[PDB]
Amino acid sequence: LDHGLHARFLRGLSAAPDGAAVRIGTTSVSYRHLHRTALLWAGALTAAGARSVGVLAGKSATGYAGILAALYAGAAVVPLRPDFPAARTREVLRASDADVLIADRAGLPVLAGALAGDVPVLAPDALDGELPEGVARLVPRPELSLSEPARCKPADPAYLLFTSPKGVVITHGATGHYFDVMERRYDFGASDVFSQAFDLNFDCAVFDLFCAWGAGATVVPVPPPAYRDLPGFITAQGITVWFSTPSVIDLTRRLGALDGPRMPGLRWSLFAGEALKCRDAADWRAAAPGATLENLYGPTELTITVAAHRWDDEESPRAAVNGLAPIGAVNDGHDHLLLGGDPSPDEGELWVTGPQLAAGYLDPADERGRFAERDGRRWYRTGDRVRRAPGGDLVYVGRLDSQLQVVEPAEVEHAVRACGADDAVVVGVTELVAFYTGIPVEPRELVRRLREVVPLPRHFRHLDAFPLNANRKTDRLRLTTMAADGYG
Ligand SMILES: C[C@H](N)C(=O)NS(=O)(=O)OC[C@H]1O[C@@H](n2cnc3c(N)ncnc32)[C@H](O)[C@@H]1O
Numbered sequence: 001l002d003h004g005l006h007a008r009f010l011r012g013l014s015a016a017p018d019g020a021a022v023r024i025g026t027t028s029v030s031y032r033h034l035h036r037t038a039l040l041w042a043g044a045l046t047a048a049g050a051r052s053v054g055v056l057a058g059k060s061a062t063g064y065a066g067i068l069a070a071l072y073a074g075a076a077v078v079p080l081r082p083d084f085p086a087a088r089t090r091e092v093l094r095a096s097d098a099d100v101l102i103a104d105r106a107g108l109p110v111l112a113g114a115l116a117g118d119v120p121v122l123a124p125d126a127l128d129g130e131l132p133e134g135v136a137r138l139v140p141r142p143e144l145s146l147s148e149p150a151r152c153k154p155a156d157p158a159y160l161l162f163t164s165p166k167g168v169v170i171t172h173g174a175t176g177h178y179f180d181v182m183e184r185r186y187d188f189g190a191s192d193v194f195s196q197a198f199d200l201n202f203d204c205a206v207f208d209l210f211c212a213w214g215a216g217a218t219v220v221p222v223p224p225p226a227y228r229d230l231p232g233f234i235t236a237q238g239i240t241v242w243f244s245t246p247s248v249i250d251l252t253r254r255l256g257a258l259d260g261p262r263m264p265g266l267r268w269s270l271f272a273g274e275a276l277k278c279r280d281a282a283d284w285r286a287a288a289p290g291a292t293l294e295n296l297y298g299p300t301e302l303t304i305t306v307a308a309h310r311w312d313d314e315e316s317p318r319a320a321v322n323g324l325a326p327i328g329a330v331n332d333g334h335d336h337l338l339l340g341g342d343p344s345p346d347e348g349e350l351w352v353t354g355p356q357l358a359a360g361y362l363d364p365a366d367e368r369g370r371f372a373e374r375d376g377r378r379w380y381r382t383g384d385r386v387r388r389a390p391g392g393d394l395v396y397v398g399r400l401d402s403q404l405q406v407v408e409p410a411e412v413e414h415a416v417r418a419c420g421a422d423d424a425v426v427v428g429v430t431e432l433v434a435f436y437t438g439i440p441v442e443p444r445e446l447v448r449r450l451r452e453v454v455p456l457p458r459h460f461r462h463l464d465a466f467p468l469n470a471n472r473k474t475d476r477l478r479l480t481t482m483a484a485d486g487y488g
Helices: 006-015 031-047 061-072 086-096 108-114 172-183 204-214 224-228 230-237 247-254 278-287 409-418 443-453 476-487
Strands: 020-024 027-030 052-056 076-080 100-103 157-162 167-171 193-196 218-221 241-244 268-272 292-297 307-310 335-339 347-353 371-374 377-388 394-399 423-428 432-437 459-462
Touching: 006 031, 006 061, 006 204, 020 031, 020 061, 027 031, 027 061, 031 061, 052 061, 052 086, 052 108, 061 076, 061 100, 076 086, 086 108, 086 167, 100 108, 157 172, 167 172, 172 204, 193 204, 204 218, 204 241, 224 230, 224 247, 230 247, 247 278, 268 278, 278 292, 335 377, 347 394, 394 409, 409 423, 409 432, 409 443, 423 476, 432 476, 443 459, 459 476
Parallel strands: 020 218, 052 076, 052 100, 076 157, 193 218, 193 241, 241 268, 268 292, 432 459
Antiparallel strands: 020 027, 157 167, 292 307, 335 347, 347 377, 371 377, 377 394, 423 432
């Protein structure tokens, strides 16, 4: 089992071959059935010489098997979003130099557009007349099926993932170090049931898949209606491990769904992608009291997550800064610094180096200003302002470049929440606009409260919800435009 990332799936296969690898609605696909499908598809990918495989698919059997088939063929997985604009998907195919495309039924309608810039398509569910004319089809033959998955070197690409817009090359070796280190934090086993909440083109979906599969556990895609009541969905499905952006907490709370211990069977409550508020952690924890909660942090260029904090109902609120839970300690095997060009013991840009470094970007020229040399080593400059609490825990404060002159928006946001908002986004237009959710407050009352907690924005906007970007993060760029249009 030295194959690479996909060796995690082989370990599940060995532990629960006939157990459910993926549960899609009212049906399951077994490890064994995914394995054989991937061997079959990989034989076709191998015969066509595939080094990079576009996976143009949703949360379908085809899409999960397509990921595995790509890895089984020794190729990088290049996830493509069927619901993304076709022209964007064209750019990604060009940039990644994808050799083959695997498409499910959600991918078919976008495929004519996707291929309108030599790239055969493996689309099991399609009829011939459903592929655009010109496009050659990969029809996997059982006689060319591999007898076993390709074995890859730690340097080989496993995944090509795009940030929000550069292509990041994630290696087998880096995911190998990642899962080795994350597995040791947890107690996953074959009876666990993992959410699959992240989109397939977002790096955290790799944790969903390979932590579950590494344990012989079951992956359960979270369909969009489920967000009307996440705790109901978790309990109905017997989900033991939950992982998402922490926006789902305020969402669930707002809908009245976060009242009482509605998730008794949950064991792990994991959040990544944006700042986690203390208050949000404690609220989720009351709703899922038998689940350990963790705040997981990191950028795509450091393989999935690169720091972790295990929430403690008593200690974490003490270490909190600006109402935000700590991001904790960097993953084992990594060093970090907080730079001001001089290191600080207290606060600065977080720089990290270690085995989880991406191999780099699809265009090396993009590395400059992002990857950096220091003390003979290669680091990733996160562009995040991070503080060290007493205790040693790191705490994320904000984007390094968010500072203004009129000011640290994150301190204003914290003051708005201490005055009663569920959440706040403070942006510049130079003056301040403070968007907030929660109970509406007349702005002169909000100012009175803010002068009481911090002895100020000139404009306050109440929203039912912040807008979210493609990754289900607060869309701060959208809000900055809303501010400029309204008050420029
Ligand atoms: C978790 C996933 N690797 C991710 O979100 N990658 S990303 O490249 O899309 O975005 C990374 C940025 O999200 C923010 N972020 C990610 N996880 C976070 C956490 N737990 N707390 C605060 N900020 C976080 C930071 O600004 C970070 O640099």
